[PDB]
Structure formats: C-alpha cells, structure tokens
Amino acid sequence: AKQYKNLVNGEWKLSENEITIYAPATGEELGSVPAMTQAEVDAVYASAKKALSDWRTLSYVERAAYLHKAADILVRDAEKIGAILSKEVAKGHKAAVSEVIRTAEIINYAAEEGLRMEGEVLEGGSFEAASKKKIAIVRREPVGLVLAISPFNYPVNLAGSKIAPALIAGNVVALKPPTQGSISGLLLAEAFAEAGIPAGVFNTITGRGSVIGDYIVEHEAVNFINFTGSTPIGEGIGKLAGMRPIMLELGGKDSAIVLEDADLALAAKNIVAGAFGYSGQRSTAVKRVLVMDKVADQLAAEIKTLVEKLSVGMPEDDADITPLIDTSAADFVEGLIKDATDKGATALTAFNREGNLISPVLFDHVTTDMRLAWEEPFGPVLPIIRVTTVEEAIKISNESEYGLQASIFTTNFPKAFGIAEQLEVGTVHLNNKTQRGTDNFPFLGAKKSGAGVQGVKYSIEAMTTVKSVVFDIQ
Amino acid sequence: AKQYKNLVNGEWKLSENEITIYAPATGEELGSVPAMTQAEVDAVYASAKKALSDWRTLSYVERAAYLHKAADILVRDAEKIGAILSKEVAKGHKAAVSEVIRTAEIINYAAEEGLRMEGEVLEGGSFEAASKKKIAIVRREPVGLVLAISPFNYPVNLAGSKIAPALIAGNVVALKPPTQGSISGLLLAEAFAEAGIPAGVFNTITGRGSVIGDYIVEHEAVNFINFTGSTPIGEGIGKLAGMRPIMLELGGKDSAIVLEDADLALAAKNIVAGAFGYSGQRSTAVKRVLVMDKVADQLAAEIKTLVEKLSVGMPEDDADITPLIDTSAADFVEGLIKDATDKGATALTAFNREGNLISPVLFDHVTTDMRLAWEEPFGPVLPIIRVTTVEEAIKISNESEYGLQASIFTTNFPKAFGIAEQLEVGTVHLNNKTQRGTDNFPFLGAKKSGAGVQGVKYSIEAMTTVKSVVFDIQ
Amino acid sequence: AKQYKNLVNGEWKLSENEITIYAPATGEELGSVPAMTQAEVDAVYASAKKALSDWRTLSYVERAAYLHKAADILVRDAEKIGAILSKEVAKGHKAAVSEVIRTAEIINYAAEEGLRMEGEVLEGGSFEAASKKKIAIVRREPVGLVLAISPFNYPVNLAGSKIAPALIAGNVVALKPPTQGSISGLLLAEAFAEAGIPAGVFNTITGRGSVIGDYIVEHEAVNFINFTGSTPIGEGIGKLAGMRPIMLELGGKDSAIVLEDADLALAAKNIVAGAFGYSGQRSTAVKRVLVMDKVADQLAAEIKTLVEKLSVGMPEDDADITPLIDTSAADFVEGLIKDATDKGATALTAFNREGNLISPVLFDHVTTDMRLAWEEPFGPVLPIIRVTTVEEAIKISNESEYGLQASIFTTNFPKAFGIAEQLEVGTVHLNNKTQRGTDNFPFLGAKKSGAGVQGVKYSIEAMTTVKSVVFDIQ
Ligand SMILES: NC(=O)c1ccc[n+]([C@@H]2O[C@H](COP(=O)([O-])OP(=O)(O)OC[C@H]3O[C@@H](n4cnc5c(N)ncnc54)[C@H](OP(=O)(O)O)[C@@H]3O)[C@@H](O)[C@H]2O)c1
Numbered sequence A, B, C: 001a002k003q004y005k006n007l008v009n010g011e012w013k014l015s016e017n018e019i020t021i022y023a024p025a026t027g028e029e030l031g032s033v034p035a036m037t038q039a040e041v042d043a044v045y046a047s048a049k050k051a052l053s054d055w056r057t058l059s060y061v062e063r064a065a066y067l068h069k070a071a072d073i074l075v076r077d078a079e080k081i082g083a084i085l086s087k088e089v090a091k092g093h094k095a096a097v098s099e100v101i102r103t104a105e106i107i108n109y110a111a112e113e114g115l116r117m118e119g120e121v122l123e124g125g126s127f128e129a130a131s132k133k134k135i136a137i138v139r140r141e142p143v144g145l146v147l148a149i150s151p152f153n154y155p156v157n158l159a160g161s162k163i164a165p166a167l168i169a170g171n172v173v174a175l176k177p178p179t180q181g182s183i184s185g186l187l188l189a190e191a192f193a194e195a196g197i198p199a200g201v202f203n204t205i206t207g208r209g210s211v212i213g214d215y216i217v218e219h220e221a222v223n224f225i226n227f228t229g230s231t232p233i234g235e236g237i238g239k240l241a242g243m244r245p246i247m248l249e250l251g252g253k254d255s256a257i258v259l260e261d262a263d264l265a266l267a268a269k270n271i272v273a274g275a276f277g278y279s280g281q282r283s284t285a286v287k288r289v290l291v292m293d294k295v296a297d298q299l300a301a302e303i304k305t306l307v308e309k310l311s312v313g314m315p316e317d318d319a320d321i322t323p324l325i326d327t328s329a330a331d332f333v334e335g336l337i338k339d340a341t342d343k344g345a346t347a348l349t350a351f352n353r354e355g356n357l358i359s360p361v362l363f364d365h366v367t368t369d370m371r372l373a374w375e376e377p378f379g380p381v382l383p384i385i386r387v388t389t390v391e392e393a394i395k396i397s398n399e400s401e402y403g404l405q406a407s408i409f410t411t412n413f414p415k416a417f418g419i420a421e422q423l424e425v426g427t428v429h430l431n432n433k434t435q436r437g438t439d440n441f442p443f444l445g446a447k448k449s450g451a452g453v454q455g456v457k458y459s460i461e462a463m464t465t466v467k468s469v470v471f472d473i474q
C-alpha cells in the first residue's frame, strides 16, 4: 500500500528500483522497500563515518536521551507497528505487538547500562617494583561503524538488540533488515528519526541479501558486523569480515534432556511451548527431546496431548501455529517430515499442509540416521529421541554442530549442573524451555551457533574497545 | 648441533624430514627441528582434544601448580635457554636471557590471575518484574584448543604470553613457533614437559609456515587462534579463522609526537631506546617522529648524538644494533633507505651495511611521499617528520594503517589526554617510549595492527567463554 | 505558614507539640513541624520493619519505578519546593531550586544504578583442589531499616542522596531532617507519597534533640545510620551505633595548594567560588590556601579583587553572600576573624556584620598559630597561608584533623599526582575547586571528615550486604 524509504543521513530516501512485500499468510500487498544500489550503500556508509566524530564526542547522558525517546515512541506506536509486523512475517498479532514492546524495553535498558560504562586503573607495581609509579588509565571507546543485520523472525527485536547497545557506546550504525521484514525494520527506524537521532548516526539499508549482501559486509567502511541469521550466511560473513570484529547469532537445535526423576507434566508443558512457539521459527526453540527410556512412553503421551491442543490458523486470530515465512521453508519442513516417516519414525500427530500452513507434527522413536535429528527445520515438527543413559544424551546432544541452548528437566539440581558443564551450549535452562530472556542475561551459542556474547551489557562490551593512557607519577 | 623434537601427547617425536637452523649473525649451525607433515599435525590436535576433558575438570590450583613449576624451570635454565635464543634470532645475549626471565614472570602472573576466575549472578527482576525469581548463574569455561603462533623476535616471551593464559583457564594448547626460533620454542616446551604437564595438554608444531601454515590454522579442531606476526599473514588468518575467535598482534608504526613544550632530552632518550632496541625489530618500537617545527632542529640533533653512540656488532657481545634476522629483511630496509634518500631526506647518520648488519640510520625532513614514512621497516632506521600544528600531527599519525601505540612528549598533560583520545591506537604513553609492559596492562592495536586485547588478564578473558545456568527460585 | 505533618505508615500525622520554623534571613514565620515523642518514633520504626518484607521481595524494576515517579514530581514542583527551601535555610532562591533539580537527578540515577547490582559466582577450586566442585552464589540483599539524617545546608539533596540508594536496594527508610530544614524535608516526603511509595517503606521523623535526639539512633530497630552533619555529632552517632554499620559525612577544611607554575587567575577564580559559595556553609569548600611565597602576592591580589565584588544580601535576591544559619554560627565566625586580626593577619577585605549577615573576609599572611588556620568556620572567611616548599604544604595540609578534599593548582600533573598520593583526603581536584560532583564519583572523607564512601554506586553498596548460597556440583 505504502512506498517505504530508507533513513539515510537524517533524510528518507527512495531508490530507482523497489521490492514489493506481501503478507505470507494471505498474499496481501503491504508496500514496497527500496532496492539499494552499491553506490547508495557507499553513501549510507559515508554519511555514518562523517557523523561518528561528533556523535562519539557527545556525553553518555546525551546519547542515552535519544534512545529513551525512541523507546517511548515505540511503546506509543506498538499497536500500529505490531499490526504491520504481524502481517509481514505471519506472526500472531498480539505476539507481534509484544515484540515491539520488548524492543523498547531493550533500548531503555541498553541506554542506562551503557551510560554507566567504567574504565580501569592498573598498577605497574602489580608486576614489577621498578614500575610502581607507572599507572594505566584504561577507558572505553566505540569501534566505529557497526553493520547490524536482523532476521525475518524478529526483525524489530533483533534489530534493536544491536542498535541500542551500539549507539550508547558511541558507534554509528547501519541496519540491514531482512527483505521479508524490511517494512517493520523501517518502521523501527522511523521511531529513531522522530526521536531526533543526528543525521548519519543511524541509517538503514534495504535490498536482497543475495544481491547486495556481500557488498555491505565486505565494505572497508564497516568496523564491526553484528549479524543474526542462518549458519551458512554467518559462515560467509566470517570470511568476508577478515580480521574485523563480529558477533554472529546463527542456527540452533536445542536439546531438551528429560531424566527419570523429572516432572513429566512440567516438561511436556515447557517442551511444547518452546518447540512450537511461532511455528518453531525460533533459534532457541526446543528442537529435539532426549528422554530416558524409562519415562519416554509417558512423556510422549503428555507432549502429544498438548500438541493436539495447539491452534492452527491465521496471524490475525493469534493462532499458535501460523503459516511459515515462505513456500521454500514449508517445502524444506515437509521434506524433513517425509524423511522421518520413510525411515520408520512414529508420527504421534498427523502431517497436514494447507498452502504454507503446516500442522504441528510430533515424531517419536527418532533415530540419529534421520535428518530431523540434526537439521534445523524452522517449522512445527519436534522429534523425540530415546536414550538409555545420561552419557548417551550428553553424547547425542553434543554431536550436533549447533550449541545454542539446552534444557534439563530433573529434580536433582546438583546433577543438572554437572550435566550442564558437559553440554556444548551457551545457556542451560533447568526445568524450563530454552529462551533468550531475560535480555540482561548472557546469550551466546557454541560451535556453529554463533560467535561473541550478547545480552545487553555483553553486547555493549563487545562493540567497544579500550584506550590505555600510561604515565609515570612523579 | 642437536636434533630437536616436538612435544606430542607427552612424547618427544622426530619427523622424517627436518629443518637445519643457523645463527643469523654468524652462520653457526645450531641444530634442526622437525618438518611436520599434515598427518602429524592431525595427531597433535587429536591428542589435545582427547586431553581437554581431564584438563578442564582439574581445579584451578592444580593447573596453576603446573604453570608455576614450568616458570621455576625456566628461571633455573635461563642462561642455557638464553644462550641458544641469542644465537638463533641474533638477539643480544643479556637481552635473550631477560626474555626467558620475563616469560617466567608472565607464566607466574597468568597462573595467579587465572585461578581467581570469577563468574556472575544476574537477576531476572533487573529487567522485568514477572521474572524476579529467575536468576542466571554465569561461569567461565575454556574455548577448547588454542593454537598459539609466536614470532621470531620474541619466540619464547610471545609464546608464554599465549600458553599460560590459555592453560590456566582450562584450554589445551598447540604452539607453532617461528621456524627461525623454533629451537627456542622447543626449549620452552621442555620446561613444561619437565613440570609434568599432562600428555596432550600442551604440544608443539614445527614446520615452515609457507607449507603447513594454512593447514594448522584452517583445521577444524582448532577453536581459537592466538597469533603474533606480520599483517599480511594475520590478514589471511582472519579469513581462514572463519567464525572462530582469534587474537592478532600485527605490524606497528608507532608515532612519537613531540610538542613545543616537551623535555627534548627525555624525548630523545626514549625515542632512541624505543626505535633502535633490537635493531628496530619490534612491533611497539618508535617508528616515526612527528615533531613541531620549532623544536625539530634541536630534537633531531639530540637524537643524532645518541644514535651515534649505539654499539653495532654481534649478539654475543650485547651490541645495541645486531644483524637483522635474514638477508631479505636487510634488503627491504636498504630499499626503504634508498627511497628516502632519492626523495631528498637528510641522512643525519650514514647508511652502512656489512652482511646483514646495518648501521643505525636517522633521517630528518622525511615527507609523506616517502615509503619510510609509512612502511614498517623492522630495521634500524628512524624517520623524523616535521609538522606545523598538533592537528597535523594527529592527522598524519592516524593516516597510518597501523595503530598499535603512540608516545606524546609534552608538559601539558590535560592536552596530552585530549590528543590521546584522538589517536587511533591501543595505548598512548606520555613522556615515555612505546612499550608492551607492564604485562598486566592491556596491549592491543587498532586498524591493521591486530584484533582482541592482550595483557595477562585480558588474554585470559579472550580465551574463555561463558556458560549460563538459569533456573527459577521457588 | 502552614502546619506540616510527618509521613508515618502512609498517613500524615501531627504531634501534640510542634516546632515553629523561621527564615534565618528575615525572621519570617514559615510554618511548623511536629515535635515527635519517643513513642511516636517507635511507631515509625515498627511500621518500617513491618513493610520491609513485602518491599524487599518486590523486583528491582518495581522499586525503580517508584523512585522515577518521585523524581518526576520533584522536577514538577522544583519552583514550589525551592522557594520554601530558600527561605528555610537562607539559600539563594535560584540555588535552592537547583538543589531540588539535583535531587531528582540523583534519585533517577540511583534507581537505574541499583537495579543493575549484580552478584558473583566463586569457585572453590580457586583455593583448594578438594573443593573444586563447590561454588558460591553470592547475591546482594538490603541491610534493613536505614536511618537517614540530612543536614541544614542541603536538606533535600543530602536527604535524597541517602533515601534513593537505600530504597532501590530493598531497604526501608526513616528520614530525620534537621529542624532548620524540616519543612523542606517533609516537602520531599510529599513527593514520595504522591509517587505511591508503599506505606511504611519511607517515613519521616521530626522533633527536638532534647526529646528524641539520641533515641532515634539508639533504637534497636535501626540497622544502619546514614548521617550528614557536624563532626562532634558524628562522633556521638558512631558510639551509639555500636557494631551497626554507619555512613558519616562530617566537617572539612579543604586545602588549595598553589604551586609556582599555576595559572593564578584560574586558581583565584576557583578558590573564591569554592570558598564563599553559600557563604562558606559547606563541608566541601576551599577553606585554606597554601601558596608558594614566590606567587603569593599576585595570587592574593587576584583573590582580593574577586572577593571585593561578591554581592552581600538576601536569599530572595540571589546574593553571593547570604545571612548565616543562626546567631551562634555568626558569633563563631566573628571570633575566628578577631583571633586572626589580633595575631597579625592582613585583612585584605573588610569585616562587616549586620545581624547574622557577615561580609566576606579575606586574610593574608595567616600563620598556623591562628584558629582560622584549622577550625571550620562555616562562614565567609578565607585564610591564605604562605609556604616555601611543597613538602611544607603537604605537612600543613595533613596536620588538619579534617581530610575531605583538596585542590592542587599547577601545570605539572605528574607532580600533582605524586602530591595527591601524599594528601590525607578522599578526593583531590586538579586545577579546580573541591566539589562533591559529579554524583557518580566517589565522595568520602578521611580522618575526622567522615566514614564510608558515598556517591551513588558506593552508597548502594554500603547499604547492602551479601547472601551466599554454597553447594557442590555432582
Ligand atoms: N541465534 C539467534 O539469536 C537467532 C535469532 C533469530 C534467527 N536466527 C537464525 O536465523 C535463521 C532464520 O532467519 P533468516 O531466514 O532471515 O536468515 P538468513 O536467510 O541468513 O538472513 C538473515 C539476514 O541476513 C541477510 N543476508 C542474506 N544474505 C546475505 C549476504 N550474502 N550477506 C549479508 N547479509 C545477508 C538477510 O537479508 P534478506 O532478508 O534480504 O535475505 C537477512 O537480513 C535460522 O537459522 C535461525 O536459527 C538466529
């Protein structure tokens, strides 16, 4: 309906070519976003680097004021933005509004976290007596221009989680939203524009990653790449970054380890909520159940009953299971479902597909020779893998190339901590689904699941460097 | 002339083929080191990953005890090791012994720093009231297998500065010393072996980086690359690293900014010591003087007087200026000198070369069109560049692709801090030469000078990750 | 003139007796505050300890919301409150409004500082191998009921500087303002009540020292005493506190050391502003100049010219010099002036007194046998003491029983740092007047100038304790 524009050096810019966005659940035309050229990318980066000097010389309190204003505007327009976001990525209406609200919360928290940045004073006399009068005054500085790249499934939340930590520290930022999700990304940018963010301090880039993706990453003007998306794309970003710093939040295949002494009802509740939330289109979703044989039959039945209770419908109706982001995703999920069936897996809930609306499929008796045991579906399908020992569960869990998070369901917490030490993941939730929040907590993935540590204070630290001034007291 | 061996899984192994090492100053045959094959590299990494489990489960004090033992052995054998190191890299005998002692100091300091590793407890109620009973127990863990690569100019010191921080945190390590310097690196390995370091926890790799260099870095078994060397090789390591974390300490072109109110005698003393130490083969060396014109004539004269008193001779005689590491290095330095001369630079001290022993050359009236104004010589040649304003000095300093350190000589310390904020370097020393110490201080380079922050406590943090355990209080 | 009430368990209470409050500059009747009995104090403390359980179990975000709301209300009523504050303690009208604004900023900053207080996870294996599986989860908790006692010269700012840090951490608070200043304190309490602070979480106490003075401190319900006032009164509070924690902000006699290379005009500007602000009725004020004799004549002349131009008049006219707080204070200041004159000091500005309005008196050639060299006047009188060495200045400065802050005026900052290390004070300001701000900086006094460390984050730590939970991983 509307022709959207990029925020470039404090002004709204059209491009010669544009990309029409459609609602994945209905095909409704939502608008268009610019298809930037390489020359327009250069202008965005040139504007950012020119604004950096005056921006980093502002006080922390002044930079924090801008972020607070943008958060206030997001809360004001949460219904407006969430309504469009719901259509753009086929997310439940209420869930879409919640994302906008959560984004404002992260921006506010990042502003107050970052303005309290402190330095250190180190003593030369800690290392050698002859240097006892030498001290080091170590203060934090920005890294420069941060390229922020958000994913389709949380195009606003996982944009703000990068923009706010970067800006408070004195960096300038360019946001590359996902094409499917660029409208919501540009709506987020409108809030920062209305808040008065100085020209060039924050800008947006839109275009198909397959066309301009490598160019925006390879560009020498960029000092830092903060990316959330698929593991293959993250792999390429790692190569193109060279020796420049990066943060990557990539794929996940979070395991849920259920021991013999677990509250099976509580486990089934958390497993189903985490696995099928947003139709399973989340990196921190429960994506495989590793359950001890003794309790597998009872756990599978309780999970099944809850899966049968999930609603399947449209975003406007706040259905639990909504249509997937596009046809390719549904075809990929259907293939994984077909593979499990052909190899003897027991489908405890039935596969059905209407367009790209896939019903929630629960598989039992999944074996490691099935693709569904390892590949990230990003769809509403959950495998149950039976194990005989906790060592096997740890073994199978760590054999995955992914290591984002894991859940352990048990009443023996000392043992759970011991298991957690052996799991090659960033975060382990006890008797709870895997999840990124609360946003002050650390969020990181091991192995192919990412690089660097996020969460608010951790993001700020990652996107800063240090400047040491050393002198001798006389 | 001994046949030296690599430390592999608690055993000392020769290889089918070996590399003969010669003292660069005299041609004396010092011994041979193995020329490992790719399969032998695979065996090293396999051994390390197998030892990781038992090593990381030990207590901090147990791991610290091994490091203290190794440091004690280094101090005991400082003269023996220093004598060979002096010959192998043409470093002054006394300075070579000092390197070994400093290495023991770093190992001891890293052991006591790392054993005090602490985690953090985060409150869910800091972010949202509904999560006030949720807490995150965040503990530190090793990253896994660290590949340490040291340079020829400090093959023992800049090996220990990587090994000890990694080991205390629970990482396993493979050390790839420089070929010219590998004997010294294997002598360091002997100390760790005699200290009883468990088999596979620490290993060595030798071989020409031009044949196995890419292979040891690209190997998927490596979780972390900690490298010190040239910028082009560091640039390639960043690409081959992919998404994996790295630390790079690359080239330097440190500027010495001398203002009109400077103590010229103090500036000349620090500039000469820092520029010509080890014949200028140091990354943190003063490599260009940016001096206000008003004081340039007198500074240049006082620097000249000190340069003329530097001793030029052999490493065994503890000469200030020793022969460069190889003929190519000397040819490169002579090339830079010719470029400056042809373009009109004033040679305050004459260029003379006997073999690869180059006399110390001081140039005045160097211009930005000369290669010596920018390229890292790694030889005993120092340019003086006159400026008319401090702004110009800052601009010329930041025009360099390097940004390791900088010195400011002035009596106005508030203004010196303001200049320091604008310099694109890791560390700024006031009224003192640039230097890495004290080793507890942060050490880092901006732009093409590196990635990550070293210094003991910073090295430990860089080579650890975090493991978060989240649960709800009831 | 209205009859004011105490906030007690969410209700506003009069007492059978009251205390009428008059403007020190005019005798104007401003209103009355209750003269509480010991039994009414018991009710205040009982209500606070009754509310503690529900208050400390709220989330940090919930507690922060109350403080932010209260700060907003103070900004709204800054003109209303400041107008009364100006009359109550004879502070300049504009300065009084500024105090209210500064209080709001401190309340906001404390709220966001406190909600981010983090805990620690400690490793048993850091100390002994046998305990390597034992970890300590250390979290912050409030100390309980904090008694906050504010001073007459900052009855709102130095109340909020205690209330807000205490409340965010989960403490409950009882505010005892000074009698002269009690109205302004109760006006501050109205803001917290309007913000919805739960009943009993924050309360006020007013009354006569002859009835409740020692009683409010001795009461066993009080877990923490946070006091700003005179040193003798602080001494007594320490005794009555027993083993309970306290914070004391007492008197000062800040030295301003002026070296031969100092900018005398800048030094004179800062010395005069710091010494005569609010007629010198501040503990953190330049109260004695220690100047090298070579520059003393020129410095004294620069100070003299500035002192002569200070305005002397009424709070309503924003005069530089306003009437002192009461007659006894003015008599005490006159006595110090007479002693200095009788012992031979040179009066560079004339002494005049109308009522309790004393004109600013500058003395030169002050010797350390004069009372004015040591005793805190709390009036507009400044001595200049000439020295011949820096060592003499340090000795004379440290001979004082006070050690709050000090100023050093010089262009040699390395030397200034060396001097600062030897000065027995909390804070040393270089080329600037002594001052408490910025409020995130530490504020503390050595020797008889106080106990504990204030500034926002330091005040929160002081008014919290830790709770350690230790268990073994299995
Ligand atoms: N770990 C986490 O925190 C987290 C959170 C959310 C999602 N994810 C992961 O993200 C994936 C799903 O999201 P997605 O489908 O949007 O991922 P994607 O296809 O990798 O795209 C992610 C972002 O990268 C951009 N991009 C694509 N090609 C690029 C290139 N060559 N160079 C630079 N940027 C390029 C895309 O732009 P276009 O939209 O124009 O292609 C988009 O904005 C899943 O694997 C999921 O696990 C991870």
Ligand SMILES: NC(=O)c1ccc[n+]([C@@H]2O[C@H](COP(=O)([O-])OP(=O)(O)OC[C@H]3O[C@@H](n4cnc5c(N)ncnc54)[C@H](OP(=O)(O)O)[C@@H]3O)[C@@H](O)[C@H]2O)c1
Pocket (backbone or CB within 6 Å): B149, B150, B151, B152, B153, B154, B158, B176, B177, B178, B179, B180, B207, B208, B209, B210, B212, B213, B214, B217, B228, B229, B230, B231, B233, B234, B236, B237, B249, B250, B251, B252, B282, B283, B284, B376, B378, B404, B445, B449, B450
């Ligand atoms: N910033 C610092 O802390 C610091 C300190 C010292 C030196 N440096 C820098 O290091 C440079 C001089 O040292 P250098 O001559 O030893 O540097 P270099 O030629 O880059 O070699 C450094 C190390 O890398 C190895 N290497 C070579 N090719 C490799 C490859 N393709 N892949 C992986 N590793 C490879 C070398 O082994 P071989 O010997 O077998 O080639 C050696 O052990 C200067 O630029 C100096 O500024 C920096």
Ligand SMILES: O=C[C@H](O)[C@H](O)COP(=O)(O)O
Pocket (backbone or CB within 6 Å): A153, A154, A281, A282, A283, A284, A285, A434, A435, A436, A437
């Ligand atoms: O891609 C989705 C990520 O997992 C995201 O963090 C989901 O949000 P949550 O886990 O915080 O609920």
